[PDB]
């Protein structure tokens, strides 16, 4: 500071260490087809939210089953992205009119597709002066059989119902209908002119490939994977129908490798061929591969049905992360929400599959159905185990996001000590929770920043270099007992 | 291509107090205010970057990380907007091509030091050119530079690493004394900013 | 009214708006209930509090802030706090419910906590008096996304009532994370 | 790596040793005539599999 | 648990030099340790001992 | 058994060292390779396969 006139001065100084906070690690992302809903990614925390916002899947998709398996196994949060074969602007619309026939508002469905042709909007008048009520109804089945869509009890009870009571036409009020109808899973309203609508009912009229899974990337609209790559909470991605669309596995693995902060879960085909000839599709350290398919009860036929196991496995990942940590291998855990498997694998066949990076789901007598295998598809010996990759992702993202205060700071010993202290505190916390291995701190990790890592050419060019060394913990895959008679 | 100038980009948006609408203006005065604030709360040796802009609504364009890799090595300073952090100045270089005056705070520190020395030494003109005056001048300049060092402006774990001052028979010869010249030599080591923060992480030990 | 009326007059013998407030040394927190109807007022309030250096700013979200996965705080100051959502009250001219921002109730909670506990006590896990209900009910899954972003929530627990659940600032500096 | 714009960089380094794993050593191959079956080689882990 | 853990105050010849005295500066250095809230209350329960 | 042991060792080495192709030909790679092969052979020695 500068002191030019007499007085009292109070100044604040920076302290000797700054805390780092860990990031989320149990959020998932799903892609696939639905019947209703928007095409921008939305967060879901429960299965009833999913049924309310999106509905069911068509016969060519198995998204509903995968989300159900995710939440039955202890998952916490999903990001849903809806993929649609229709143009984004193929949306049903409508108009509201005033006393003498002026269009005052414009109603639009909340997503593209033919479903918007089955939405009815009903306007009625309220008992209080200058107020009216609005109702929105949606039927999932045939419209030809709906007898009284306007009455208090239609012939088939509607699938979705929404009512808004205290509405007004004053734009500066808090009960203006544009502000109240904004939280609605069915429609959108836009204001045009001054007036209040007349009573009655009205319907909305005039309504996949690899490039749809890739998504749209425009200045104000993102779908598909382009929409996911602008969300920083997702830590694992899955596409249940990845084997019906050629060229999607590589796109998913490339997305995860280019972001550098997420993991890919892959499932085998329904018919992968002979056992002696199976291989993994990719050779990435950012993916894992599971086998075989599973059996579930179908809620529209009440019969068994064969589905891929991806969502159940993502739910197992989330559960293990919540109750043990990211350093725990998500294997030797039970699958909930299924009836049986496609095949039963023996111990002789897994001796051929396990050294190849293929993870198996097996069933033991007296113990149930469990995941038996925790490897990645990688050939590098340094990234053979899955929990090591997940721990490194967690650590690296925490460091990246929690150190932006240090840019443009003086390149001298105070900043060096501060940075060293922060990183040491974070790594000691990780060590205390069982993630690092060693009976002392010197065995588990080290951090270096000073004149041993930086030279003078570095200081003259603006570079601050920190070197960190760590020792992760690995699972026990073979438990061996050697018993003898001696001593 | 001067060492006495800095160059900022792009324009900003403000509310106009006669129309109550947005309006696009150059960012010069906001940046000068940031300079003044940083000088008041940190010192002249602190780079006036990674600081927030107050009093605006938005920018003209949003610059990405790929475009700044082309602009930054050219001496052009950018104003960017980060999600979760706001609008900030990201760059602290001069328009100069000389490698000795690449950073802005070094030039500002030298301006400060040189003007202080120029204005606070006029008592020494026409004084006797002998050892007493030499010791007096040396002592004064050493006190000033040690004060600058203690406040974080100079770099080194000891005084010998940060600066030196010389005045005597090693700087002056006899032809100098006969012609009325008193020569003082000063050497200094300024501190520079941390522009790239690098973390190299491995699995060994 | 405009932004220049909220800024106030600054003449030798007349001060209104914020120019009038900056000559009073008792004020310790400032709030403007209608800050979302006048564009450019949030920044002016945060700048006033940062330039005086002795007061704190309380901010409320809009009535329609968008999807949950896209919310952010308006500023990145250590001199401000951000609360969400709106509340319901009885209107004394119609005797009906009405939706209002929660700023004044929260300032009253600040004052109460300061009187009965001290300035070192976090003004959270405290009850809101004088309301009827909230705008939305926030779950535990949605606050896991909002809390690490500096957004403070007002929630309702069964058996315990309506309470403020969160005590952070809008700041990104790790040294000024808590209020 | 190359550093052209200011920010934070995180980089991974290769470690000082890489593990080697032993290969299988107790699998056999048989050739001869049968009454049924395919003519591509198939893996068998039990005699009932062979008869089937 | 003690005063040395909570704060310190310094003013003397460790904070001021002679160039400071000659220019009219009096420097006081204060260090403090504030208390922070309990946001996560965690109970780890086991069967051992 | 000598022939069978050599078959085992040579195939393990062949299949578990493909990361080293096109790497820099300098002291770091040398130390890394030496360390890996020494660990494998010490494991073989501890199980009674080598003599000394």
Explain what the structure shows.
By secondary structure, chain A is of the alpha+beta class. The first copy, chain A, is built from twelve helices and 22 strands. In chain A, the strands form six sheets. Chain A has an eight-stranded mixed sheet, with helices on both faces. Chain A has a four-stranded antiparallel sheet with strand order 8-7-6-10, with no helix packed on it. In chain A, strand 19 and strand 20 form a beta hairpin. The longest helix of chain A is centred in the C-terminal third of the chain and has 20 residues. The radius of gyration of chain A is 29 Å and the shape is flat. The relative contact order of chain A is 0.12. At the A-B interface, helix 9, helix 10 and strand 22 of A face helix 1 and strand 9 of B. Strand 9 of chain B pairs parallel with strand 1 of chain D. Chain F: This is Phage tail sheath protein FI. Chain F: Belongs to the myoviridae tail sheath protein family.
């Amino acid at each position: 500071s500068e002191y030019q006139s007499p007085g009292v001065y109070v100044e604040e100084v920076q302290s000797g260490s700054k805390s780092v906070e860990g990031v989320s690690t149990s959020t998932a992302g799903f892609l696939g087809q639905t019947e209703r809903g928007p095409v921008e990614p939305r967060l879901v925390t429960n299965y009833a939210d999913f049924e309310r916002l999106y509905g069911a899947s068509p016969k060519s998709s198995d998204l509903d089953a995968a989300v159900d398996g995710f939440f039955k196994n202890g998952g916490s949060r999903c990001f849903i992205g809806r993929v649609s074969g229709a143009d984004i602007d193929d949306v049903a619309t409508g108009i509201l009119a005033d006393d003498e026939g002026n269009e005052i508002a414009e109603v639009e469905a909340n997503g593209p597709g033919q479903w918007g042709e089955s939405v009815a909007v009903i306007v009625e008048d309220s008992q209080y002066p200058n107020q009216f009520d609005i109702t929105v109804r949606y039927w999932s089945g045939d419209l030809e059989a709906v007898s009284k869509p306007h009455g208090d009890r239609p012939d088939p009870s509607p699938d979705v119902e929404e009512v808004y009571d205290g509405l007004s036409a004053d734009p500066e009020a808090s009960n203006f209908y544009e502000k109240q109808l904004e939280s609605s899973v069915l429609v959108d309203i836009e204001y045009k002119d001054d007036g209040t609508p007349v009573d009655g009912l009205t319907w909305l009229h005039r309504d996949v490939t690899l490039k749809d899974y890739e998504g749209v990337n425009k200045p104000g609209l993102r779908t598909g994977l382009a929409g996911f790559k602008a969300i920083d909470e997702i830590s694992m991605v899955c596409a249940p129908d990845e084997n019906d669309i050629d060229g999607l596995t590589d796109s998913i693995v490339a997305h995860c490798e280019n972001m550098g902060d997420r993991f890919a879960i892959l499932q085998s085909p329904q018919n992968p061929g002979p056992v002696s000839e199976m291989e993994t599709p990719v050779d990435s350290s950012y993916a894992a591969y599971y086998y075989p398919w599973v059996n579930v009860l179908d809620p529209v036929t009440n019969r068994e049905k064969l589905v891929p196991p991806g969502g159940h496995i993502a739910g197992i990942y989330s559960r293990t992360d919540q109750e043990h940590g990211v350093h725990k291998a998500p294997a030797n855990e039970t699958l909930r929400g299924i009836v049986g498997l496609q095949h039963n694998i023996t111990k002789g066949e897994q001796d051929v599959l396990n050294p190849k990076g293929i993870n198996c789901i097996r069933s033991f007598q007296g113990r149930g159905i469990r995941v038996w295998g925790a490897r990645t598809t990688s050939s590098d010996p340094e990234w053979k185990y899955l929990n090591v990759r997940r721990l490194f992702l967690f650590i690296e993202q925490s460091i990246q996001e929690g150190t932006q205060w240090a840019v443009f700071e003086p390149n001298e010993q105070d900043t060096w000590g501060r940075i060293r202290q922060s990183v040491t505190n974070f790594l000691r916390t990780v060590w205390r929770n069982g993630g690092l291995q060693g009976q002392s701190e010197d065995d588990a990790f080290y951090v270096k920043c000073g004149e041993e890592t930086m030279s003078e050419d570095d200081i003259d060019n603006g570079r601050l270099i920190v070197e960190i060394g760590v020792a992760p913990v690995k699972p026990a895959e073979f438990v061996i007992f050697r018993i003898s008679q001696d001593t």
